[PDB]
Amino acid sequence: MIQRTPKIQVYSRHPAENGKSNFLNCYVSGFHPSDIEVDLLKNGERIEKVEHSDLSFSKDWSFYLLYYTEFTPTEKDEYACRVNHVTLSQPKIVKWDRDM
Amino acid sequence: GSHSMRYFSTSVSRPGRGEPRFIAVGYVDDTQFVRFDSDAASQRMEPRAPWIEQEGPEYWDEETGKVKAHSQTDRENLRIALRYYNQSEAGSHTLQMMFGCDVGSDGRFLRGYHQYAYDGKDYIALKEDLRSWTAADMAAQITKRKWEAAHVAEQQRAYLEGTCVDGLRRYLENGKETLQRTDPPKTHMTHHPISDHEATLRCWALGFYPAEITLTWQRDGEDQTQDTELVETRPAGDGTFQKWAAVVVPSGEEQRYTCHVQHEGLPKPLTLRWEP
Amino acid sequence: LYLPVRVLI
């Protein structure tokens, strides 16, 4: 119909400093249809306390959602975003990079 | 110093499952202030910004009314869509509408918007003259000849140039600190020695409102679209935005590269250079 | 302010 593949950014709200509390965001943009799955992963294990923004869309009619949870970053722990959409032949994992 | 108020609705049919889900959000500039959800318990139009909360129970009653009735109208405008396109009752389908209005520095109306999109593609849109339609394909041309016969553009034009513009001027005052702050971007560079003959400079721009920000790179003043990566402006979560732009540079020539952050919270544009 | 009109395609 128009199926449009999602674009995923994984970042943090503030510059990441270990032991200092922050927020992990996952920003999925430019997809279509709206029905999408977005898990925030702490060490390959799925976070449950995960909030997300209200369904909105850009002027080309493709949607954007900001999933976010609280996180205290460390140097050993690994965070990622698991996005799944009809246009993904299999779920797409995007690791959190401290400088991206 | 012009402003904008936008309203984005999404009907997603769920055949076999429930009634069609309806989500709807309202923005002044890049600040959402309301939302409504047909799957929500409250069944009310809700607030999502401080400055809207200070609005009477009169307001929330009437806003819940119109959103609840766009709810039902767009449910049938999906059923119509099927008959138009001869489509199986089986399929989930998306009908988005966008309406809004721009004001300038002064507060005079500048432009109205009202339009639709079936399944990701344009359907119909109100043109700038506020007196004619743009029918994307041939089904939309049914709606066009019908919304023309019914002088529907007239009716929109009375909200757009009137009621819409009013709410914009109002919202813009009730919340004149959220919506009329221009928080400037916070800048700093980073440096990751990749291979042992290359490096990466990343230009960071954090904590800004509004979202519109320009970040270009320059090798000797000449702008560089070449070994560059520029991530979409993105939300931070608290209403500030962040973007970054980064370049692969030959190792040693770090300071042949300058970064150029141009935001409106900045008096002059920002030049940035490496420097340990 | 949400749009009052509710026409059908």
**Which residue ranges make up each domain of chain B?**
1-181, 182-274
CA–CA separation, B131 and A35 (whole Å): 35
Closest CA to B206 of B233, B224, B182: B233
Which residue type sits at C4? P
What is the spatial distance between Cα A60 and Cα B233, in angstroms, rounded to a whole number? 16
Who contacts A82 (Cβ-Cβ below 8 Å, separation ≥6)?
A37, A38, A39, A40, A41, A46, A91, A92, A93
Residue recorded with tokens 């209005």: B101
* A34 contacts B12? CB cut-off 8 A: yes
Q: What is the largest CA-CA distance in chain A?
A: 47
Contacts of C8 in chain B (CB under 8 A): 73, 76-77, 80
Q: In whole angstroms, what is the distance from residue B102 CA to residue B97 CA? A: 17
- d(CA B41, CA B63) in angstroms, rounded, equals 17
CA B11 to chain centre: 18
Pick from C1, C2, C9: which is nearest to B81 by CB? C9
Q: Show Cβ contacts of residue B202 under 8 Å, excluding neighbours closer than 6 positions.
A: A99, A100, B189, B190, B191, B192, B244, B245, B246
* Sheet containing A45-46: order of strands: A45-46, A37-42, A79-84, A92-95
Residues in chain A within 8 Å Cβ distance of B23: 34, 54-55
- Beta carbons within 8 Å of B115's beta carbon, 6+ residues apart: B97, B98, B99, B122, B123, B124, B125, B126
CB contact under 8 A, B120 and A68: no
Q: Which of C4, C2, A93 is nearest to B167 (CA)?
A: C2
C-alpha B95/C-alpha B78 separation (Å) is: 7
Dump the DSSP string for A32-49.
BSS--EEEEEETTEE-SS
| β-pair partners for A96 | none
Tell me the one-letter amino acid at A75: E
Nearest alpha-carbon partner for A61 in B6, B38, B118, B166: B118
| Cα dihedral sign, B45-B50-B55-B56 | positive
Residues B7, B99 contacting (CB under 8 angstroms): yes
Give the residue among B36, B12, B41 at the shortest CA–CA distance from B24: B36
- Do the Cβ atoms of B207 and B186 come closer than 8 Å? yes
Asked whether the bond before B15 is cis by omega within 30 degrees of 0, the reply is: no
Q: What is the resolution of this structure in A?
A: 3.0
Domains along chain A?
1-100 (2.60.40.10)
Residues 147-186 of B with CB under 8 A from A: none
A23: its two tokens: 């927020």
Using CB atoms and an 8 Å cut-off, which of residues 84-123 of chain B contact chain A? 92-94, 96, 98, 117, 119-122
Number of CB atoms found within 10 A of residue B165's CB = 21
HSE (side-chain half, CA atoms, 13 Å) at B22: 20
Return d(Cα A30, Cα A7) in angstroms, integer: 6
Residue in B with minimal Cα distance to A15: B206
Q: DSSP letters along B120-160, please?
A: TEEEEEE-TTSS-EEE-SSHHHHHHHHHHHTTHHHHHHHII
HSE value, Cβ hemisphere, 13 Å, CA-based, for B232: 12
Residues 6+ apart with CB under 8 A from B138: none
Q: How far is CA A65 from CA A16, A38, A68, B238, in A?
A: 22, 9, 10, 14
Q: Which among A2, A55, A68 has CB closest to B10? A: A55
Angle between helices B139-149 and B57-85 (to 10 degrees): 130
Residues 6 or more apart whose Cβ sits within 8 Å of residue A42: A71, A77, A78, A79
Please give, rounded to a whole number of angstroms, the shortest distance from the CA of B7 to a CA of chain C: 8
How was this structure determined? It was done by X-ray
Strand partners, B245: B203, B230
Taking an 8 Å cut-off on Cβ atoms, the answer to whether B84 and C9 are in contact is yes
Q: Which of residues 237-256 of B touch A (CB under 8 A)?
A: 237-238, 242, 244
Query: Cα-Cα-Cα-Cα dihedral of B31, B37, B43, B45, to 10°?
Result: 20
Chain C neighbors of B72, CB-CB under 8 A: 6
Q: Does the N-terminal peptide bond of residue B269 adopt cis geometry, omega within 30 degrees of 0?
A: no
The phi and psi torsions of B28 (rounded to 5 degrees) equal -110, 120
Beta carbons of B74 and B96 less than 8 angstroms apart: no
Residue A98 tokens read as: 């401290």
